[PDB]
Amino acid sequence: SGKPVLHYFNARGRMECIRFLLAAAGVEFDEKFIQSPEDLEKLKKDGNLMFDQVPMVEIDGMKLAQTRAILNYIATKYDLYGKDMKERALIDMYSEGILDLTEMIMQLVICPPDQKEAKTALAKDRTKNRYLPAFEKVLKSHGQDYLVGNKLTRVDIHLLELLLYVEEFDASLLTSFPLLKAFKSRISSLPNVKKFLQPGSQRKLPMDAKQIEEARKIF
Amino acid sequence: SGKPVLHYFNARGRMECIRFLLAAAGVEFDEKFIQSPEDLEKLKKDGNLMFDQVPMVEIDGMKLAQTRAILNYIATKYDLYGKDMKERALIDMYSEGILDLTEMIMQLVICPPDQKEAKTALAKDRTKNRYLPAFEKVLKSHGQDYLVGNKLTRVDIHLLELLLYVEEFDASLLTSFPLLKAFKSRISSLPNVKKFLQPGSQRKLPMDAKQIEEARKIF
Numbered sequence: 403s404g405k406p407v408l409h410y411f412n413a414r415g416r417m418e419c420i421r422f423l424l425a426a427a428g429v430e431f432d433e434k435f436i437q438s439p440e441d442l443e444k445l446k447k448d449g450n451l452m453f454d455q456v457p458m459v460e461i462d463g464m465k466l467a468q469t470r471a472i473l474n475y476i477a478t479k480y481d482l483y484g485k486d487m488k489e490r491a492l493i494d495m496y497s498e499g500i501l502d503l504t505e506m507i508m509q510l511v512i513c514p515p516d517q518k519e520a521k522t523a524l525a526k527d528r529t530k531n532r533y534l535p536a537f538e539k540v541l542k543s544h545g546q547d548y549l550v551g552n553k554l555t556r557v558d559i560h561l562l563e564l565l566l567y568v569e570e571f572d573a574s575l576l577t578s579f580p581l582l583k584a585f586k587s588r589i590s591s592l593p594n595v596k597k598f599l600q601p602g603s604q605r606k607l608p609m610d611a612k613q614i615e616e617a618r619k620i621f
Numbered sequence: 622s623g624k625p626v627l628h629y630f631n632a633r634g635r636m637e638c639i640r641f642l643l644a645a646a647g648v649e650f651d652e653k654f655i656q657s658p659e660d661l662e663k664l665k666k667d668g669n670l671m672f673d674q675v676p677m678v679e680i681d682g683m684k685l686a687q688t689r690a691i692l693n694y695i696a697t698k699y700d701l702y703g704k705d706m707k708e709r710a711l712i713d714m715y716s717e718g719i720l721d722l723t724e725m726i727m728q729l730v731i732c733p734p735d736q737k738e739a740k741t742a743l744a745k746d747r748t749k750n751r752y753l754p755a756f757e758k759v760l761k762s763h764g765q766d767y768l769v770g771n772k773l774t775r776v777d778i779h780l781l782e783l784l785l786y787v788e789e790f791d792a793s794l795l796t797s798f799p800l801l802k803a804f805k806s807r808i809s810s811l812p813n814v815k816k817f818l819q820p821g822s823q824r825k826l827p828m829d830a831k832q833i834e835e836a837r838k839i840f
């Protein structure tokens with residue numbers, strides 16, 4: 403089989419979603435954490451990062467970089483990419499909006515302190531008046547347990563991850579989304595997911611303060 | 622067949638790549654240009670933008686939003702997405718780095734004037750010391766006319782588009798990349814592409830000044 407090698411900083415960043423996807427597929431993986439600028443330079447020196455950047459996953463003989471390229475690949479091979487040409491349109495259109503808000507939130511602990519409060523208000527607004535209603539809409543439309551195809555797919559995992567971050571951001575934002583709430587429980591309960599959520603796994607912690615400082619050396 | 626409907630501002634923005642892809646596939650499309658905040662509000666009011674945003678293409682009965690979702694869909698249906706599960710890894714990993722630099726350049730005519738010169742220097746550096754060598758590497762590795770699978774795919778089109786923007790940015794940056802140069806000629810010469818490049822097509826003009834101002838009302 404071969405255990406994929408993920409290269410990244412000891413942080414969620416962009417690799418987090420990849421970690422989540424792999425674990426959900428029940429595929430064990432090895433990681434090499436970039437801990438020093440040296441590590442990174444050495445990494446680049448090897449000529450294995452197509453654009454001198456990470457994420458980069460060694461898998462099936464490829465040195466696949468680019469978050470979406472990696473995820474996309476993993477999704478197909480582990481049948482987490484739906485049944486056909488239209489389901490993926492849905493999955494695709496559902497994952498990107500999920501990526502959007504994710505970044506939106508990320509920014510919060512990265513922006514000029516002078517403007518945090520305002521960005522946060524926007525993020526909350528967006529979260530509850532744009533994103534959540536959208537996904538909730540999707541669930542309410544078919545009443546089935548999975549977002550697409552009534553079969554587990556990558557967005558289900560992606561949605562879970564986002565919901566977990568929204569819960570870390572402002573938990574009250576999720577209290578008016580029943581099906582989403584229920585969804586979170588369901589997906590979280592999946593054996594693979596549960597294991598990953600259990601402490602002692604490759605899931606990385608949220609950043610800020612402690613992590614903000616460590617970023618101020620390499621990330 | 623049905624002619625897809627693309628909703629967007631009268632600008633390249635994020636839809637440009639979609640326009641390029643469609644034309645390359647020889648698929649005619651209709652567009653409804655967002656010309657007034659009203660237009661946009663009305664557009665949103667209809668409840669057809671999953672996240673209240675555009676790009677959004679009506680196609681095959683879907684109101685598909687999300688740039689990458691749309692492109693991805695178009696690529697598969699018009700067989701511009703390679704032969705298999707590994708070629709797309711390549712295509713994927715090649716399109717995103719192409720999207721990266723694109724945005725990088727975009728920023729130039731959007732950043733605080735105080736810092737343009739510096740960002741531009743970085744963009745030029747990146748262009749010629751990171752991106753171009755990468756794609757050039759890909760071409761030099763197999764000597765065939767297409768980047769992947771020796772068959773025309775979406776990245777070929779995406780690469781062309783980027784090269785055209787790099788040519789608009791700083792043409793001298795392309796003079797040390799033979800195969801890229803040749804590639805540009807080849808792809809540009811493709812009947813579908815040529816037509817699109819010919820004036821009087823749906824290809825949008827670059828922004829700034831004239832366009833900067835018009836953005837200051839809606840975009």
Ligand SMILES: N[C@@H](CCC(=O)N[C@@H](CS(=O)(=O)O)C(=O)NCC(=O)O)C(=O)O
Pocket residue numbers: 415416454455456457467468469470621717721
């Ligand atoms: N589009 C890339 C972005 C990757 C990226 O920006 N990588 C950064 C690090 S981080 O922002 O993700 O932390 C990097 O490797 N930068 C190092 C370099 O470019 O030399 C992706 O999604 O994979």
Ligand SMILES: N[C@@H](CCC(=O)N[C@@H](CS(=O)(=O)O)C(=O)NCC(=O)O)C(=O)O
Pocket residue numbers: 498502634635673674675676686687688689840
């Ligand atoms: N991730 C989306 C981004 C789309 C986006 O940001 N759309 C903006 C307009 S633009 O930045 O592309 O010009 C929008 O519709 N904003 C209106 C709104 O959000 O209400 C995509 O790639 O499709």
